[PDB]
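call fold target=RadA
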Amino acid sequence: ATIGRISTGSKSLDKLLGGGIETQAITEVFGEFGSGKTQLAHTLAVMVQLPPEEGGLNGSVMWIDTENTFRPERIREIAQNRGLDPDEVLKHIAYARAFNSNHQMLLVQQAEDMIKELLNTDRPVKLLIVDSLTSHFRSEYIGALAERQQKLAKHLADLHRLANLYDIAVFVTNQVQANGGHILAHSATLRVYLRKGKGGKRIARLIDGEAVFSITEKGIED
Ligand SMILES: Oc1cc2ccccc2cc1O
């Protein structure tokens, strides 16, 4: 398949990304608590449902939530301010809460079943969100870094296989602050560092110019 792109909602961020986040790729956004990673996830879950003329892929979404941070009311707001019907937008987001890192890994295998079911339809899965990808692994493997890296590596390999096999954009978040970070090392297709700037602006930079945007009723925008 050709590489599809999903607009982030921000022209600035889209330019930095070459048009938007790519299908057949894992995009990892990392930064401190409160930097806006989950807001970007919510925005992408709406944008992907637009037609290509508006920066979407007419796509369905699957969302694995590890921190109980998914907010349907926020999806509704973004959808209503992106000219979409909020009920339709929510009906095309499949949502699951991961109880722990092992359940998170099983949910990726489960996601493949729904991906296959929708593959030949007019609303194939085009976006798989894992927010947060690392939080359970970090808490469960304190003092056991080598084992943590083994499990994360298999999890990321599973996500890669889905991205490439089914032409999906995988978008993952990773909280990194004071003294923290192996990030996801070199595993993601693309690493985006997100931070707060003056006056509530958010700033994004590719790791391996900078885009600037705001969090608004449209999700994010210039
Ligand atoms: O109904 C489902 C929703 C999911 C969401 C994320 C990952 C896997 C899922 C599997 C489901 O059957």
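return ok
The helical segments are 11-16, 37-47, 72-80, 86-91, 101-118, 135-140, 145-166. The first strand starts at residue 5 and ends at 6.
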